[PDB]
């Protein structure tokens, strides 16, 4: 295994280093506004060395943006694909590339058999070529790597089954900035090439000047280079025709033949395209070839890529004709005029890459190596696209919830083969597809119109329900005596109880377990642990009585804590935000211990009085002018007092101190250690009254954030043996700090209400001497080193925080893990900040046509880990990566993949079993079974189950960390006949494993295995 910590990779271009050296000056470079006047030697190409030009027709189809997926399909896409089929069929030399499989599948299944065959033929013959082949072209900033893989697999599995093809070239022309997580996954999925477009204009200029636009992109920790994937970065401002033929859009626009008038399009540079004729072809060709040769100067081979397309292009038959005919005339002339020394033709993306590598093998070009990412993107001036790291945070959080539900549903149902009547495969396909669709760069990004966001939400809600159905049916089968099991595949044996989604104060969705002497004495509950190691976690349920005790199935008492059910309300009368307690519902909390990838059953029983093994939390309401707070049957009376500083400690965990405003002030790790200053503060960013305004994409603050006026907020302190908390009702945010014995959990119920042109940020202030360095993760896969650059505006220093961020000095580190992707930064030494929500009244001129005024309450969750790191073996000062500690990694897992809770619906569960998976191996803490999916339906003689195994890299800080079993996923199911290593999509077999044993992977590696069972 490669050492991902101590060996700094030697690469030609390291993005953090490049950023440190670049000046980012935004000067007018001429016709190529952000470049320079390209010059070339006409004698460079000749009869013995011609410029090969591939014009690649394409159509960018957004699976939702200003219209819903279905609206675009009906109005545009079905026509684009229908006419593509006809035109390609009738013109053998014409070519076309397609990226969005969600749309292609929607189209293909509606086609008659005759047309399906014609479609398969033009794909088989190479006229229509799929690029990437994912369900969508995903966002690369907010997306979790697990979902990027999910959507890629969804699209490619469909392509293999119906088109009999698997793309090895990727096309990503629209994500707002690019992540190395893409080549990571792609390279492990059979890919050999990839193309990107939206990178900072300064970066394009810098790399263009050194002809480093094509490079071998390797991971930041990869010293050997085995993760490298050839990457092509487009050099200009856009992927549209005016910015893809050469450096001068005024000239290139004249070669977009759809802009002559009848199509309602024109050229903003004032010179319209002109139909090619024998009379003007010589002059037209001279202009075009000149542009091509200028573009060619920016690359190293004699093979040039010229994309020909735009948003939803090639829709009308007349459009296909106008583009094809005019280009055909240009090709005939150019290719017949030796003085040009050019051979141009329509081509596909793969054809371009094949030619490039042929030139490379011929030894005419050597490519540079590169590591790093391409955030934060700016398309012009100071317009940095960091706003979408936070836009529509409700759905960003929903993404992570559904991500987990999909994993749990696929895993729980994978243990058995199901009869078709159970509709398991049907529900799982629906769930995977709705989640996959949301990975779109206008989905999770929060950059779609309001009604489109609603469509995505509805789709995900249906996916969540599908997931619940599959999960509960699976639990019933896994924990019921075989000879008693009698399933009704439409019946709900269990109801899922989720305490953090939609969340308290967001939607009263979770059910109350109703117990009573005259109705029902007890209730069975079951917890699922999707992680491959034994796990303990506190779980809570709402019960109709405070006198409830918990037992495991062996009837062993389990220590429990009962607390009130508190809800915060914006009192319109008193003009205050205060909590009200329920007098009929209560929260029971207890520690559940669940097997690796298993289930554990517990029983809740009511009694007439306080049970021996259940304790009750004390409650203290701090504020002036308090009023009574009755809690019905709740044992202890609420206490009151004027606001004051408080200190709390649960178990042997840390001791936290809070200000009289209910905000964290310090953390004391041990009784001996000191009180380390760690202050939570909420501030607000505004919008500029002059110039460019912030919108769904852009973050254009009117200066540093201003503190939110808190006044004298109401603070609620709940102290219990198992769980304690401090909650405060601040303007726009009910902030909560929860303690359960380890790193605290932070929950923010964010309701920005009607505060227009405001962005609410949560900041942490410490004494950590971090300087200008901080770390943020990329797609929940890796942590990359960031350097605050004062030479860039505030918004440029904001980065995606898909799952976590941290700052550190020689001795201390503070890590904030998130349960949702949001934007964040470290604007000063010792600080960490992350945006909660943003409400913007104006549009930011990127085509959305609206601001962001559809905010809704969202419950954001986090874990805050303060640690001493002076003893940890960390990367050298020059290493571009960072790594989490065991505690921080586990805290992240507690947020993204918590235990699942099921409540038995009926009064009695006959044949109930107390546990499943007690014999499953408990794998090393850094290893995870990211995916477990049965790949075959019940009718298959040989069943196949696929697994995606990921091993992260945790810092070694002197902790023994022992007793763990080797995890062989191929033997998790009985009767294994063969074990194979496959691409991450499970589509290609890479190795036949001897002994049918799937070996564990190396740190930072991800592998896929498929076990076959007779
Ligand atoms: C799929 O493509 C492969 C190309 O290697 C070919 O051998 C095979 O016959 C094709 N199968 C079909 C008909 O889908
Ligand atoms: Zn797009």
Question: Domain holding 480: CATH number?
Answer: 1.20.1270.50
**Backbone torsion region of residue 154, taken as left when φ is above 0, otherwise alpha when ψ lies between -120 and 50, otherwise beta:** alpha
Structure tokens that stand for 759 in this block: 């962005």
How far is 78 from 64, CA to CA, in rounded Å?
Answer: 14
- Ligand number nearest to the C-alpha of 847: 2
3-state secondary structure (DSSP) of residue 396: helix
C-alpha 466 to ligand 2 mean position (Å): 28
Structure tokens that stand for 60 in this block: 């960018």
| Residue 319 contacts residue 258 (beta carbons within 8 Å) | yes
Sequence-distant (≥ 6) Cβ neighbours of residue 553 within 8 angstroms: 601, 602, 603, 912, 913, 914, 915
C-alpha 357 to ligand 2 mean position (Å): 29
Nearest Cα neighbor of 192 from 19, 350, 333 is 350
Q: Measure the CA dihedral 149/154/160/166, to 10°.
A: -30
Domain match, 665 and 574 both: no
C-alpha 85 to ligand 1 mean position (Å): 21
- Resolution in A, one decimal? 1.4
Measured from the Cβ of residue 220, the count of other Cβ atoms closer than 10 Å reads 27
Structure tokens that stand for 502 in this block: 């939609």
- Ligand number nearest to the C-alpha of 160: 1
C-alpha 136 to ligand 2 mean position (Å): 10
Q: Measure the CA dihedral 595/597/603/609, to 10°.
A: 70
**In the beta sheet, which residues pair with residue 844?**
none
Q: Measure the CA dihedral 458/464/466/471, to 10°.
A: 180
Write the residues followed by a gap in the chain (C–N more than 2.5 A): none
DSSP assignment letter at 1014: -
Domain match, 190 and 269 both: yes
How far is 297 from 51, CA to CA, in rounded Å?
Answer: 11
Instruction: State the catalytic residues.
Output: 174
Pick the last residue of a domain from 492, 516, 548: 492
Q: Measure the CA dihedral 844/849/853/857, to 10°.
A: -90
How far is 741 from 863, CA to CA, in rounded Å?
Answer: 12
3-state secondary structure (DSSP) of residue 983: coil
Domain match, 437 and 481 both: yes
How far is 654 from 742, CA to CA, in rounded Å?
Answer: 7
Handedness of CA 291, 296, 302, 303 (dihedral sign): negative
| Residue 707 contacts residue 698 (beta carbons within 8 Å) | no
Domain match, 321 and 414 both: no
Domain match, 175 and 59 both: yes
How far is 578 from 570, CA to CA, in rounded Å?
Answer: 7
582-586's contacts with Cβ under 8 Å and 24+ in sequence apart are: 582/631, 582/632, 583/630, 583/631, 583/632, 583/633, 584/544, 584/632, 585/512, 585/542, 585/543, 585/544, 586/542, 586/543, 586/544, 586/545, 586/546, 586/548, 586/562, 586/633, 586/634
Q: What is the CATH number of the domain that holds 794?
A: 2.70.98.30
626-630's contacts with Cβ under 8 Å and 24+ in sequence apart are: 629/579, 629/580, 629/581, 630/581, 630/583
The phi, psi pair for 202, rounded to 5°, reads -70, -35
C-alpha 124 to ligand 1 mean position (Å): 9
Owner of token pair 């920005």:
752
C-alpha 93 to ligand 1 mean position (Å): 23
- Ligand number nearest to the C-alpha of 443: 2
Domain match, 417 and 430 both: yes
C-alpha 641 to ligand 2 mean position (Å): 55
Domain match, 573 and 709 both: no
- Reported residue count of the chain is 1014
| Residue 478 contacts residue 454 (beta carbons within 8 Å) | no
Structure tokens that stand for 97 in this block: 């590339």
Q: What experiment produced this structure?
A: X-ray
- Ligand number nearest to the C-alpha of 988: 1
Q: What is the CATH number of the domain that holds 36?
A: 3.20.110.10
C-alpha 62 to ligand 2 mean position (Å): 5
**In the beta sheet, which residues pair with residue 706?**
684
Nearest Cα neighbor of 827 from 835, 818, 838 is 835
690 labeled binding residue: no
Output the CA–CA distances (angstroms, integers) from residue 900 to 54, 469, 472, 526, 926, in the order listed: 52, 13, 10, 8, 21
The span from the first CA to the last CA of the chain, in angstroms, equals: 33
How far is 695 from 583, CA to CA, in rounded Å?
Answer: 44
C-alpha 173 to ligand 2 mean position (Å): 8
Burial class (CB in 10 A: 0-12, 13-18, 19+), 223: middle
Structure tokens that stand for 194 in this block: 């990839």
C-alpha 134 to ligand 2 mean position (Å): 14
Output the CA–CA distances (angstroms, integers) from residue 75 to 65, 70, 71, 261, 952, in the order listed: 13, 9, 6, 21, 45
Preceding omega of 376 cis (within 30 degrees of 0): yes
Domain match, 914 and 962 both: no
Measured from the Cβ of residue 117, the count of other Cβ atoms closer than 10 Å reads 10
Nearest Cα neighbor of 150 from 385, 434, 550 is 434
C-alpha 163 to ligand 1 mean position (Å): 9
Preceding omega of 502 cis (within 30 degrees of 0): yes
How far is 228 from 162, CA to CA, in rounded Å?
Answer: 30
3-state secondary structure (DSSP) of residue 119: helix
CA atoms within 13 A on the CB side of 479: 31
| String of DSSP letters for 938-972 | TT-SSEEEEEEEEE------S----------GGGS
- Ligand number nearest to the C-alpha of 175: 2
Domain match, 216 and 363 both: yes
Q: What is the CATH number of the domain that holds 938?
A: 2.60.40.1360
C-alpha 176 to ligand 2 mean position (Å): 9
Measured from the Cβ of residue 772, the count of other Cβ atoms closer than 10 Å reads 14
Domain match, 485 and 502 both: no
- Ligand number nearest to the C-alpha of 123: 1
49 labeled binding residue: no
174 labeled binding residue: yes
How far is 881 from 777, CA to CA, in rounded Å?
Answer: 10
The angle formed by the CA atoms of residues 808, 809 and 814, to the nearest 5 degrees, is: 25
C-alpha 125 to ligand 1 mean position (Å): 12
Pick the last residue of a domain from 331, 352, 381: 381
How far is 97 from 101, CA to CA, in rounded Å?
Answer: 12
- Ligand number nearest to the C-alpha of 62: 2
Structure tokens that stand for 688 in this block: 């500029």
How far is 62 from 100, CA to CA, in rounded Å?
Answer: 8
Return the percent helix, strand and coil in the chain, to nearest 5: 25, 30, 45
Burial class (CB in 10 A: 0-12, 13-18, 19+), 642: exposed
Owner of token pair 């969340």:
503
809 labeled binding residue: no
3-state secondary structure (DSSP) of residue 453: helix
| Residue 432 contacts residue 425 (beta carbons within 8 Å) | no
Sequence-distant (≥ 6) Cβ neighbours of residue 731 within 8 angstroms: 577, 708, 709, 710, 711
Q: How many domains does the chain have?
A: 5
Domain match, 876 and 911 both: no
- Ligand number nearest to the C-alpha of 441: 2
3-state secondary structure (DSSP) of residue 855: coil
C-alpha 390 to ligand 2 mean position (Å): 18
C-alpha 49 to ligand 2 mean position (Å): 37
Centroid of chain to Cα 296: 35
C-alpha 158 to ligand 1 mean position (Å): 15
Radius of gyration from C-alpha coordinates of the chain: 30
Structure tokens that stand for 780 in this block: 């929940």
Structural domain boundaries enclosing 340: 1-381
Domain match, 603 and 622 both: no
C-alpha 441 to ligand 2 mean position (Å): 6
3-state secondary structure (DSSP) of residue 687: coil
Q: In 788-830, which ranges are E strands?
A: 799-801, 804-808, 812-818, 822-825
C-alpha 226 to ligand 1 mean position (Å): 30
517-520's contacts with Cβ under 8 Å and 24+ in sequence apart are: 517/606, 517/608, 520/907
Pick the last residue of a domain from 492, 512, 531: 492
C-alpha 164 to ligand 1 mean position (Å): 6
3-state secondary structure (DSSP) of residue 15: helix
| Residue 773 contacts residue 878 (beta carbons within 8 Å) | no
| Residue 865 contacts residue 893 (beta carbons within 8 Å) | no
| Residue 494 contacts residue 524 (beta carbons within 8 Å) | no
């Amino acid at each position: 295994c490669q050492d991902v910590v101590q060996d700094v990779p030697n690469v030609d271009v390291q993005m953090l280093e490049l950023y440190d050296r670049m000046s980012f000056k935004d000067i007018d470079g001429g016709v190529w506004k952000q470049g320079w006047n390209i010059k070339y030697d006409p004698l460079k190409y000749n009869a013995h060395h011609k410029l090969k030009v591939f014009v690649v027709p394409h159509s960018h189809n957004d699976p939702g943006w200003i219209q819903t997926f279905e609206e675009y399909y009906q109005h545009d896409t079905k026509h684009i694909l229908s006419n593509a089929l006809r035109h390609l069929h009738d013109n053998p030399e014409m070519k076309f590339i397609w990226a969005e499989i969600s749309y292609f599948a929607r189209f293909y299944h509606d086609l008659g058999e005759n047309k399906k065959l014609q479609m398969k033929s033009i794909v088989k013959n190479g006229q229509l070529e799929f690029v990437t082949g994912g369900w969508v072209m995903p966002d690369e900033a907010n997306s979790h790597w697990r979902n990027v893989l999910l959507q890629l697999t969804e699209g490619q599995t469909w392509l293999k089954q119906f088109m009999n093809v698997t793309p090895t070239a990727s096309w990503a022309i629209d994500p707002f900035g690019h992540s190395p997580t893409m080549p990571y996954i792609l390279q492990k999925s059979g890919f050999k090439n990839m193309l990107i477009q939206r990178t900072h204009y300064s970066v394009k200029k810098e790399l263009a000047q050194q002809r480093q636009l094509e490079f071998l992109w390797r991971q930041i920790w990869d010293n050997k280079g085995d993760t490298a994937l050839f990457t092509h970065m487009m050099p200009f401002y856009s992927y549209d025709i005016p910015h893809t033929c050469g450096p001068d859009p005024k000239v290139c626009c004249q070669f977009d033949f759809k802009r002559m008038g009848s199509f309602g399009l024109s050229c903003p540079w004032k010179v319209p395209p002109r139909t090619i004729s024998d009379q003007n072809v010589a002059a037209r060709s001279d202009l075009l070839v000149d542009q091509w040769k200028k573009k060619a100067e920016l690359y190293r081979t004699n093979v040039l890529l010229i994309p020909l397309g735009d948003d939803f292009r090639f829709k009308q038959n007349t459009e296909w004709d106008v583009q094809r005919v005019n280009y055909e005339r240009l090709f005939e002339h150019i290719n017949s005029q030796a003085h040009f020394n050019v051979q141009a033709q329509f081509g596909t993306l793969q054809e371009y890459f094949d030619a490039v590598h042929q030139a490379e093998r011929a030894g005419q070009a050597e490519f540079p190596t590169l590591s790093g990412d391409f955030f934060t993107y700016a398309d012009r001036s100071d317009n940095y696209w960091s706003g979408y790291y936070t836009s529509r945070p409700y759905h960003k959080r929903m993404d992570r919830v559904l991500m987990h539900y999909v994993r749990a549903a696929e895993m729980l149902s994978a243990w058995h083969s199901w009869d078709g009547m159970a509709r398991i495969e049907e529900r799982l396909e629906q769930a995977r597809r709705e989640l996959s669709l949301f990975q779109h760069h206008d989905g999770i990004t929060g950059t779609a119109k309001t009604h489109v966001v609603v469509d995505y939400e509805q789709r995900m809600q249906e996916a969540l329900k599908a997931c619940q159905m599959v999960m509960q049916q699976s639990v019933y089968r896994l924990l019921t005596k075989p000879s008693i099991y009698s399933p009704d595949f439409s019946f709900s044996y269990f109801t899922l109880d989720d305490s953090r989604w939609p969340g308290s104060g967001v939607e009263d969705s979770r059910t109350t377990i109703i117990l009573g002497e005259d109705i029902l004495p007890s209730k069975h509950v079951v917890m699922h642990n999707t992680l491959p190691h034994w796990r303990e976690q506190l779980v809570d349920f709402y019960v109709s009585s405070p006198f409830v005790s918990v037992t495991d199935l062996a009837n062993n008492p389990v220590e429990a804590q009962v607390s009130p059910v508190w809800s915060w309300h914006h009192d319109t009368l008193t003009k205050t935000i205060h909590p009200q307690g329920s007098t009929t519902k209560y929260r029971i909390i207890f520690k559940a211990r669940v097997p690796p990838m298993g289930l554990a059953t517990y029983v809740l029983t009511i009694s007439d009085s306080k049970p021996e093994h259940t304790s009750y939390a004390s409650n203290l309401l701090l504020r002036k002018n308090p009023t009574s707070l009755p809690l019905g049957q709740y044992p202890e009376d609420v206490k009151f007092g004027d606001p004051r500083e408080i200190s709390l400690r649960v178990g042997n965990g840390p001791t936290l101190a809070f200000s009289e405003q209910g905000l964290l002030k310090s953390i004391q790790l041990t009784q001996d250690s000191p009180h380390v200053p760690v202050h939570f503060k909420f501030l607000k960013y505004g919008v500029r009254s002059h110039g460019d305004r912030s919108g769904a994409y852009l973050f254009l603050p009117n200066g540093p954030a201003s503190p939110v006026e808190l006044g004298q907020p109401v603070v609620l302190v709940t102290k219990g043996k198992l769980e304690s908390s401090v909650s405060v009702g601040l303007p726009s945010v009910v902030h909560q700090t929860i303690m359960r014995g380890g790193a605290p959990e932070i929950r923010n119920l964010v309701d920005i209400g009607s505060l227009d042109n405001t962005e609410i940020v949560m900041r942490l202030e410490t004494h950590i001497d971090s300087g200008d360095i901080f770390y943020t993760d990329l797609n929940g896969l890796q942590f990359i080193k960031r350097r605050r650059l004062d030479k860039l505006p505030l918004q440029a220093n904001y980065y995606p925080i898909p799952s976590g961020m941290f700052i550190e000095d020689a001795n201390t580190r503070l890590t904030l893990l998130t349960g949702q992707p949001l934007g964040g930064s470290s604007l000063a030494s010792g600080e960490l900040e992350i945006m909660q929500d943003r409400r913007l009244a104006s549009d930011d001129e990127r085509g959305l046509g609206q601001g962001v005024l559809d905010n809704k309450p969202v419950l954001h969750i986090y874990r805050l880990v303060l640690e001493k790191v002076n003893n940890c073996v960390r990367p050298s000062k020059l290493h571009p990566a960072g790594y989490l500690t065991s505690a921080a990694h586990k805290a992240s897992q507690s947020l993204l993949d918590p235990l699942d809770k099921f409540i038995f619906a009926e009064n009695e569960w006959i044949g109930a079993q107390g546990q499943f998976g007690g014999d499953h191996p408990s794998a090393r803490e850094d290893l995870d079974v990211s995916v477990m999916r049965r790949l075959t339906k019940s009718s298959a003689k040989t069943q196949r189950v696929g697994y995606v195994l990921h091993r992260t890299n945790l810092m070694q800080c002197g902790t023994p960390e022992e007793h763990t079993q080797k995890l062989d996923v191929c033997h998790l199911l009985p009767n294994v006949a063969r074990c194979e290593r496959t691409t991450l999509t499970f589509l290609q077999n890479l190795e036949h494993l001897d002994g049918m044993v799937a070996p564990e992977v190396c740190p930072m590696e991800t592998a896929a295995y498929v076990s076959s069972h007779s």
